[PDB]
Swiss-Prot record:
ATP binds at N36, D78, K97, F123. The modification N6-acetyllysine is found at K43, K69. This is Heat shock protein HSP 90-alpha. It is found in: Nucleus; Cytoplasm; Melanosome; Cell membrane. ISGylated. The TPR repeat-binding motif mediates interaction with TPR repeat-containing proteins like the co-chaperone STUB1. The lineage of its organism: Eukaryota, Metazoa, Chordata, Craniata, Vertebrata.
Amino acid sequence: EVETFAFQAEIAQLMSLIINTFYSNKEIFLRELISNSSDALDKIRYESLTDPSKLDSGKELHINLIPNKQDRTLTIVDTGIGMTKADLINNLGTIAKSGTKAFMEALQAGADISMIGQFGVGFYSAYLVAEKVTVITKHNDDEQYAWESSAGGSFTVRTDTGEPMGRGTKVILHLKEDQTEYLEERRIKEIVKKHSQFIGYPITLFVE
Ligand SMILES: O=C(c1ccc(O)cc1O)N1CC[C@@H](C(F)(F)F)n2nccc21
């Protein structure tokens, strides 16, 4: 049922760096996750230009931000391309190893953590706020999977039997105790307006 994988060493490093570096500007996590979502939506969109049936799994290309104060989760759902199991395991569809190298090298050359998205590993910025991240994902012609990590060197992948989502990715941020501001409507609004105001898909901030 549940497979446990080791993060590649460089991703493990990246993540402990994100977890362990003092860095107050934690809100960038959301930009980075919306941006990922945006990229996956682009991707399904691009694909659907030559195969519109790729959108049978849901035509609406959107990003939903779903704070849940009870579960202490902020969930970002996109109806993007989704990820195959292979993508999930392979750093959620990124070139995370090399990107981490470039990111480490950028940090050495003056960069700050907010630039994480330039190096294609801004997903891991989730770990600025989330003690655990769960990624539910559904790519066409592949099953729904849940990926999960609380960092510490390993993630899990399992075939997800919960809510079918049609297509896309849902990133569930199990927020750190002290990062509950990211569940506040106005805060989320503020960050989305600050950092994601031009994202080309509708972003719906769900209310509680
Ligand atoms: O499914 C995702 C996805 C991943 C993380 C996230 O936070 C939200 C997402 O929708 N993908 C799809 C695979 C990959 C690709 F599209 F570039 F190939 N990619 N790149 C950024 C986002 C994603």
